[PDB]
Amino acid sequence: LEAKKEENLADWYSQVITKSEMIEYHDISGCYILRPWAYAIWEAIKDFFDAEIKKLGVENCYFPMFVSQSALEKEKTHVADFAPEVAWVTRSGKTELAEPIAIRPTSETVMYPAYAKWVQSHRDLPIKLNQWCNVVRWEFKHPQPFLRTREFLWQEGHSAFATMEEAAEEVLQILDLYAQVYEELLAIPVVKGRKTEKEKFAGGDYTTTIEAFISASGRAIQGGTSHHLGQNFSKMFEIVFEDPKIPGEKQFAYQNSWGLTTRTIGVMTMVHGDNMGLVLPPRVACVQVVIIPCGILSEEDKEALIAKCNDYRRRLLSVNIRVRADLRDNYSPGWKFNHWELKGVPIRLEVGPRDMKSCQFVAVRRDTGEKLTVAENEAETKLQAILEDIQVTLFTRASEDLKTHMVVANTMEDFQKILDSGKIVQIPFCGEIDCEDWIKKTTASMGAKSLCIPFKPLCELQPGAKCVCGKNPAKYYTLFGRSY
């Protein structure tokens, strides 16, 4: 690892994700290989999230990757937004197809004709389905691994309800689960909010979001999204049922969709990584503890040291810690030290002949670098205690970043200065698309975009507050900033 995170963030990022063996490049730009070290993080996210949505009554399924042109076009605003980056298959071999078929950029238009078939009466609702799959958004802008890619893995849940109230309830439940993914699994603090009219999902009624801050770049990124689609799709796909109270009155289902992608891993890298490499929160780390023999002497001594390393390995497995003993004669201890530091293993467990003589070992925390000498007696307990402290510590520092870099401004001048110091800003906002474009133009390296209207803003909007445009009154404190 040669580039420094605070001097060239992009070269740093590329080096960190490849040398930690998370990502490999592919010969088709914007598509990245998820090697096991990254894929394991995705599997930990999947385990937690899939269990949580099962408790809500969501079931997993799998819908086709291809959508017909006429299904794709049924919801005019949705298709208008996605059509420029929809990839089209036009032949198999050299045989042109009867009609071009599209790869899903998102599955609303694949799933909802089926929903219309399945909703025959109000008894058939709710429908609550989720799929873990890949989607393709073939934009020609520059990709960035994890954060903005042409193919990505995600989960997308689609729910249909007989009542708007039940749908509005699920929207926030799912958003709170996304916040838990970031804050409890990834140790990343996020801000819950709603998108402005300009930024909301096309075809939806409103979009709720969690926003994460990457202080290295002073930029925010959306981490997960939970939309209320209302009746905009059900009226176009005829997901209908007869009103139970009133004979012959047809009603349209109320729908939500919600998504979360492997962008998570990238945010995790950008927030916690350092100049020694990846830093893994213990909750998602493939390997939580790596055991490494040091020193290295008698044949009996070397055999006894390896035996002690495996005593530690087994007693850690005894209490469900994910542990690897790296007992390779190939590489020196210092080499392995920096290799596993590069991969972000929370704890390095060092066992040398002297410490083993003294019935103790050394535990080295990846986040702070602190070396603790621990009696062998404590091993499982202490290490668990340390892993929890690492998780909290990561969260705490990132929270202090967010608190430091998210502030209120009530004037465009204050706004601009704070923005150019590398922070995100909550300003009073009129909500109009034209004024949002004006903000993006006059704050331009990029202009600031709206990130979200926070559920809980830093300050109370005072009666009669003007927007920063000055022309119209303010409707809400809105978090603005530069965005990935």
- Contacting positions for ligand 1UI (CB under 6 A): 30, 137, 139, 141-143, 148-150, 152, 222-225, 259, 261, 263
- Give min distance, CB of 270 to a copy of itself, in A: 20
> How many CA atoms are closer than 13 Å to the CA of 142, on its beta-carbon side?
3
Best CA proximity match to 367, nearest among 341, 349, 385: 341
Q: What is the rounded CA–CA span in Å between residue 192 and residue 182?
A: 11
The option from Cl ion, ligand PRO, Ca ion, none interacting with 106 (CB < 5 to 8 A, set by class) reads: ligand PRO
Terminal C-alpha separation, the chain: 24
The option from Zn ion, ligand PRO, Cl ion, none interacting with 469 (CB < 5 to 8 A, set by class) reads: Zn ion
300 annotated binding-site participant: no
411 annotated binding-site participant: no
222 annotated binding-site participant: yes
The option from ligand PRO, Zn ion, ligand 1UI, none interacting with 430 (CB < 5 to 8 A, set by class) reads: Zn ion
- Give min distance, CB of 105 to ligand 1UI, in A: 9
Triad 371, 387, 55: Cα angle to 5°: 170
- Of 195 and 308, nearer to ligand 1UI (C-beta) is 195
The option from ligand 1UI, a copy of itself, Ca ion, none interacting with 123 (CB < 5 to 8 A, set by class) reads: a copy of itself
Our finding on whether 106 is near ligand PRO (CB under 6 A) is yes
Our finding on whether 259 is near ligand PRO (CB under 6 A) is yes
The number of residues that bind ligand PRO (CB under 6 A) is 9
- Give min distance, CB of 17 to ligand 1UI, in A: 13
The option from Cl ion, ligand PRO, a copy of itself, none interacting with 60 (CB < 5 to 8 A, set by class) reads: a copy of itself
The number of residues that bind Zn ion (CB under 5 A) is 4
Residues 356-385 binding ligand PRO (CB under 6 A) are none
**What element of type H or E holds 97?**
strand 95-103
Q: What is the rounded CA–CA span in Å between residue 325 and residue 344?
A: 15
Check residue 184 and report its DSSP letter.
I
**What tokens appear for 149 in the block?**
């890619």
- Of 224 and 353, nearer to ligand 1UI (C-beta) is 224
Q: What is the DSSP string of 232-270?
A: TTHHHHT-EEE-SSSTT-EEEPEEEEEEEETHHHHHHHH
In whole angstroms, how large is the CA radius of gyration of the chain? 26
From residue 282, give the alpha-carbon distance in Å to each of 172, 361, 365.
27, 20, 11
- Of 94 and 456, nearer to Cl ion (C-beta) is 456
> How many CA atoms are closer than 13 Å to the CA of 123, on its beta-carbon side?
1
> What are the residue ranges of helices labelled H in 292-432?
299-317, 333-342, 353-357, 379-405, 412-420
Residues 419-438 binding Zn ion (CB under 5 A) are 430, 435
- Of 78 and 366, nearer to Ca ion (C-beta) is 78
108 annotated binding-site participant: yes
Question: Among 16, 49, 147, 156, which residue interacts with ligand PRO (rule: CB under 6 A)?
Answer: 156
Binding site for ligand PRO (CB under 6 A): 106, 108, 156, 201, 225, 227, 257-259
